[PDB]
Structure formats: structure tokens, C-alpha cells
Nucleic acid binder design. Structure first.
Length: 219
RNA sequence: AAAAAA
């Protein structure tokens, strides 16, 4: 009967997780306890919930309902020291952590926690070692976090339903996997022999790489 | 083939 507010952090097939107001923990909810159509829930969405502990009576709130700290002016470059727990559910800390380093890159100047509402692209796989460009808020947390990834180019080699492979080699001479959900813009269909621009992400838990932010560049 | 996580 205890009522809280928070932000959608994870969405699975019939359940998800809500990031707490303080951005320091997550709460489970089953979709049968969401007061609406869960297909319309997006990551970052503001919600009100009641603890049963899992959450119940999860309710969508109007955008900008939940006050947040002011975001301070100017951007910074940082490095991710720890991911958000959503991508490593066994890690002790909930929040991710970004560090700003000194010029030798061997002393931490400042540290900034982040959560789902910190991220510009809430689907990006932000992991230890990733470079980010971001803002700091009045509470010291990271906001407006953008991943800074090197762009590569390659031809599409094959397409199998909702995924395919690029002529860009990773381990063992294997060709780089991509999922169609990463294809940017209003491209109706890629074909083998098209050229795409992309970044490479390697999942540090299972070692698998994929192409992200895939943009067709040939006419 | 389920409600705690490709």
C-alpha cells in the first residue's frame, strides 16, 4: 500500500523492472499489474507504483511529472567504469559509474553515477571501458550520456530474416553479426553488397560482437 | 513451457 514513483528500466516479455526515484535500486513488476497496455511502455517512462518486494498497480504518469535535478551546463568526456545493473543482474551496485580522468588517464578526477534516465539512447550497450560524452547534474549524477564509438564501414554479406552478417571480421575470421533493429532510418530493405556504416559492440558477458547504429551509405 | 533478467 506504500506508493512510490520511478522510471521503467527493463522490459522483458511479460515483466520488467522499475528504477527507483533515487536511481539506486530496481523493482520487479509483472505486466498483469501494469494499468495499461505494456506494449506502449518505453524505457525511461515515468510511473507510479505500489509495493506488494515486487510492484503492483503500476501506472503511467504524464511526461515530466517527476521533478529531477537541474542539468549543469557544458559537456564532458568520461569513461564507463561500471555498467548499469540491467546488463549484469548479479552485480552488487545498481547504478552504472562514469569517471572523468586526468590527462595521464591514471587518476580519477570525478565520478558520476548513471541510470536509465541518464542515457540518450536507452538501448545502447554501455559497458566498462566505453567512452562517453555527457553532462553532470546538480546531484553529481551523469545526464545526457552519449556513447562515443568509432565508426566502421563494410558491405552486407548476407541476410537471414531479422539479422544478417557484414564483411567485417572479428574473432576466428567470423563475420560480424547485425540485427535489423539496429538499421537506422527508413531503409526498407538491405541487400548483400550494400555498404553500411556502423559501430562494433562486444558483449563482455558472452564475448559476442554485433554491429550497431547501422546506416546504409550506398545509393 | 509460466513471474526475477539472451
Amino acid at each position: 500500500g506504500q506508493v512510490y514513483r520511478g522510471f521503467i528500466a527493463v522490459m522483458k516479455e511479460n515483466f520488467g523492472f522499475i528504477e527507483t526515484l533515487s536511481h539506486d535500486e530496481e523493482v520487479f513488476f509483472h505486466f498483469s499489474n501494469y494499468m495499461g497496455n505494456p506494449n506502449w511502455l518505453e524505457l525511461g517512462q515515468e510511473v507510479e507504483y505500489t509495493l506488494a518486494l515486487p510492484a503492483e498497480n503500476v501506472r503511467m504518469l504524464p511526461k515530466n511529472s517527476i521533478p529531477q535535478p537541474a542539468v549543469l551546463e557544458t559537456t564532458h568526456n568520461g569513461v564507463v567504469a561500471r555498467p548499469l545493473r540491467c546488463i549484469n543482474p548479479d552485480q552488487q551496485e545498481y547504478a552504472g559509474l562514469i569517471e572523468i580522468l586526468d590527462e595521464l588517464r591514471t587518476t580519477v578526477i570525478s565520478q558520476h553515477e548513471f541510470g536509465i534516465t541518464s542515457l540518450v539512447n536507452k538501448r545502447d550497450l554501455l559497458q566498462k571501458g566505453d567512452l562517453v560524452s555527457f553532462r553532470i547534474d546538480e546531484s553529481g549524477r551523469a545526464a545526457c550520456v552519449n556513447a562515443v564509438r568509432q565508426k566502421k564501414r563494410a558491405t552486407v554479406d548476407s541476410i537471414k530474416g531479422q539479422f544478417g552478417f557484414l564483411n567485417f571480421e572479428v574473432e576466428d575470421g567470423k563475420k560480424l553479426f547485425f540485427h535489423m533493429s539496429e538499421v537506422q532510418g527508413n531503409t526498407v530493405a538491405l541487400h548483400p553488397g550494400d555498404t553500411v556504416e556502423f559501430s562494433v559492440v562486444t558483449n563482455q558477458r558472452n564475448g559476442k560482437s554485433s554491429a550497431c547504429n547501422v546506416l546504409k551509405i550506398n545509393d
